[PDB]
Ligand code: EMC
Ligand code: EMC
């Protein structure tokens with residue numbers, strides 16, 4: 001199949017300004033990388049916004065929680081929260 | 094354009110995990126700050142993605158160009174490029 005969304009998201013964030021001959025080209029390449037992650041041909045506005053939120057949520061998690069969440073390959077913010085809440089539940093019981 | 098979207102975007106990016114009492118509330122607050130920046134009630138899908146591209150383009154500029162472009166508050170990627178093209182021409 002095609003690459004996992006996370007490969008696309010990383011390529012979008014890892015593209016470097018000196019990778020293209022000038023700003024017009026850089027902006028064109030970024031657009032193309034961003035479409036391949038956020039997939040506007042298949043996702044609604046709401047689904048896109050959810051992926052943008054999820055990315056930032058992962059970015060701000062303390063390291064140990066971040067690794068755990070990452071390993072669960074979440075596709076939205078609810079999935080990310082529930083895998084932390086599953087630990088917390090099992091500790092509170 | 095307006096100096097305000099940069100405000101809401103920086104608030105979305107600067108929000109810290111310790112500012113919420115827990116993960117559910119953290120993600121809830123992120124959704125709201127995200128919506129304040131990307132304004133889905135007034136922007137199309139295509140317009141939202143231009144704001145995501147614009148943020149990454151400015152993020153990859155070297156330090157002074159980054160400050161220069163930021164201070165001109167471009168509303169999209171095309172506008173950011175023109176800012177750099179206008180500067181190039183004022184320096185040559
Ligand atoms: C649904 C996250 Hg702006
Ligand atoms: C505006 C193309 Hg991700």
Ligand SMILES: [Cl-]
Nearest residue numbers: 117118120121
């Ligand atoms: Cl919730």
Ligand SMILES: [Mg+2]
Nearest residue numbers: 114115116117
């Ligand atoms: Mg709680």
